[PDB]
């Protein structure tokens, strides 16, 4: 799990003394900048064709 957290696979934390793993909540990806990149990547293609 630590190696998984290293590479950004999951952002969950771990209480080693206890043992349980708790994870963060990341929703509302629409406000993020990534969908604009997704749209641009294929705007380029449709303009090239």
């Amino acid at each position: 799990v630590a190696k998984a957290i290293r590479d950004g696979v999951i952002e969950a934390s771990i209480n080693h003394e206890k043992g349980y793993v708790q994870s963060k909540e990341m929703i509302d990806i629409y406000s993020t900048r990534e969908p604009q990149l997704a749209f641009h990547q294929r705007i380029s293609f449709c303009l090239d064709i």
């Binding site: 799990v1 630590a2 190696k3 957290i5 290293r6 934390s13 771990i14 003394e17 641009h40 303009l47």
Partner: protein, 116 residues
């Protein structure tokens, strides 16, 4: 075993070589595992106990633990290890987006009306 986090089996096998000692390379391997685990624990969790930290890393209780902490930060507390916490510098930024978006939109309009 090394490609992912499975490391207990690595140290178990370090004592199992049917060929010869191979201490020459498994040594280097031990060092490059120690430093990597020291780097990875820096963000896994908020707090560790000093005995637990000393034991999860395979060294025992020598001054080596103290020296390893000294080499890094790892400021102690009352049987406590403080977490290094930041992870918030990057967000809430638009100016660099506000420039490269302008570049990108200009690029869209470039090859749109001129004959290509």
């Amino acid at each position: 075993y090394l490609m992912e986090g499975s490391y207990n089996k690595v140290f178990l096998a370090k004592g199992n070589i049917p060929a010869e000692s191979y201490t020459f390379f498994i040594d280097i391997l031990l060092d490059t595992i120690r430093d990597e685990i020291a780097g990875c624990i820096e963000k896994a969790y908020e707090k560790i106990l000093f005995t637990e930290a000393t034991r999860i890393l395979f060294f025992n209780t020598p001054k080596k633990m103290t020296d390893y902490a000294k080499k890094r930060g790892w400021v102690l507390g009352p049987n406590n290890y403080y977490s290094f916490a930041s992870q918030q510098q990057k967000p809430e930024d638009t100016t660099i987006p506000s420039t490269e978006l302008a570049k990108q939109v200009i690029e869209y309009a470039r090859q749109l009306e001129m004959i290509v």
